[PDB]
Structure formats: C-alpha cells, structure tokens
Amino acid sequence: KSVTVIGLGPMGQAMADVFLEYGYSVTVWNRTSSKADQLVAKGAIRVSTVNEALAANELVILSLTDYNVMYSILEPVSENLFGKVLVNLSSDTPEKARKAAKWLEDRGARHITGGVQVPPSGIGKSESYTYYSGDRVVFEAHRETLEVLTSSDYRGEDPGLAMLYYQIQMDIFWTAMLSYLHALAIANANGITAEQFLPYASAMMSSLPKFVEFYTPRLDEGEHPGDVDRLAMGLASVEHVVHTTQEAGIDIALPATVLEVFRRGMKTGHASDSFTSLIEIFKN
C-alpha cells in the first residue's frame, strides 16, 4: 500500500488524505511545496523534486490542473519514466488524453485516464464513480488502489474514452440546464414562479430517457423514418417556442440556435424524416 500523488490542489489533497486514512504510504510533490504542509502533518512524505516523487512508487496519480502541466514537469525528466504507471485526472478532451498516453508510452511508461465524476468531498465514498480508460491489464493491476478513492467504471482501451464519456454527459448537462433557465425566464415573464414550474420541468426531464431509449436502436441502424414524427412538424413546434420567447421579451439566442439546426436539416432534404436526422447536421 504505497502511492505517489503529484499535484496538491483540492482534489490531490482529498485523495492523498483518503490514502493516508486507509493506511497507504503516500509520497507527494507540488511546485509550491507549502501546499503539502497539512498532509505532511498527517504522515505524507513530501519530496523536493519530481525525480524523487517518480522514484518512490510504480503508481503515480497526476491531479494536475491540465495536461500541459504534465509535459512541463515530465518532459525534462523523460529518462526516468520507465515502468511507471501515470493516472491522469486532468479534465480535458479525448485527443489530449490520447496524445499524452502515446508520449508516455514512448518513454516506457503506461497511462490510465481518469474522469472523476465528483468534487473533492466525494473522494473516499463508494457511491462516487470515476471513468477509467487505457490498457485493461494495466488498469486491472491498479484497480484495488484506485477503488480506495471511488468506485470505478472502466470504459475501454482507448485512453480518450474516460474523457469522452465525461464530456458528452456535460454537453447534455449544460445545454439542458440552460434550457431550464431559459424556460423559467419565459415563465417568470408570464407571472409563474420556479416553485409552480418545478413539477412540470421535472416531469419533462424525467421523460427524456424514454425518448432516448426509443430512438437508440434506430440511430444505431442509421434509420430516421418519419413513422412517429416528422422534422417539418418539429420545426413548426420550435417556431412556436421562438415566438413565445420573443413575445415574453426573453433572449432568443438559445432557441434561435435550435431553430437554425432544424432549418439546416430541412434545407438538406429531411422534411419527411424523423428529427433524429438532425444528427447528420451535427456530423457536419
């Protein structure tokens, strides 16, 4: 039970704490060496250099701000990476994580990508989940240590996948939550409160998985028949939303973008297809 943590922001601090709680020997490094004071008081071993941190252990957790920090601190010590397993937790794009894995492999190290789904306070709780991706044999070799921090959800071999599943979920979260705020602004303009809207907003959100379930097999076939819905009629529905927004004096940017997507789909010949055919507009 021995692990190195490089990067002592809030996440790194939480992780290092939980490891110390469960009896691990924890070696730490940070560019600003004072950030480790509280951990050192709890038994963490602070080392002066990146070299010493890498030497201490096979498993190295990288809780850095972004992937550029990784290159900055490891590139000058590229000769010292053989046999190390670097678990990268920065939030970034799939391609960033892929480029990092390849760079590390070229220097004899192995990479596990992690997409942590909770804030620092979730660390050490089994109801918390982290996406992991990368070589399955490397991941299985360190799974026990990683699961001291959270439950795991291994997504596959591609180092980019842990970040893929994280970012596409955030695409839905932010866009759908903004739609909720937008809808509430219209509601407020017409005299209705968030308390009054609550059960209706909630019921709509909860209904969406049933649509996703319905359309999933069709989307996987590349099929957009107009048997239960037509794009033309979706467009007309969006248009009512845009006019409602305008009448209420609410900012039109968000529904106007939705309307523009529908129009582009109509303008490429999809009037009679399902609205799912708009995936072709996004695909590019």
| Burial of 202 per CB tally in 10 Å (0-12, 13-18, 19+) | exposed
- HSE of 53 in the Cβ direction (CA atoms, 13 Å)? 25
Does 187 sit near a copy of itself (CB under 8 A)? yes
Site for ligand NAP in 120-179 (CB under 6 A): 120
Candidate ranges 31-39, 51-59, 247-255, 256-264; the one touching ligand NAP (CB under 6 A) = 31-39
Site for ligand NAP in 86-125 (CB under 6 A): 90-91, 116, 119-120
Among residues 26, 60, 73, 112, the one that binds ligand NAP under rule CB under 6 A: 73
Closest distance between ligand NAP and the C-beta of residue 220, in Å?
25
Of the pair 78, 91, the CB lying nearest ligand NAP is at 91
Does 51 sit near a copy of itself (CB under 8 A)? no
Radius of gyration, alpha carbons of the chain: 24
State which amino acid sits at residue 23: G
Closest distance between ligand NAP and the C-beta of residue 283, in Å?
27
N-term to C-term CA, the chain: 49
User: Residue 160's binding partner, choosing from ligand NAP, a copy of itself, none, with beta-carbon cut-off 5 to 8 A by kind?
Assistant: a copy of itself
User: Residue 55's binding partner, choosing from a copy of itself, ligand NAP, none, with beta-carbon cut-off 5 to 8 A by kind?
Assistant: none
| E strand spans, 80-219 | 85-88, 110-116, 125-133, 150-156
Does 28 sit near ligand NAP (CB under 6 A)? no
Backbone angles phi, psi at 35, to 5 degrees: -60, -20
Cα 142 to Cα 263: distance, rounded to the nearest angstrom = 50
Which residue do the tokens 């969006």 mark? Answer: 238
Residues that bind ligand NAP (CB under 6 A): 7-12, 30-32, 35, 63-66, 69, 72-73, 90-91, 116, 119-120
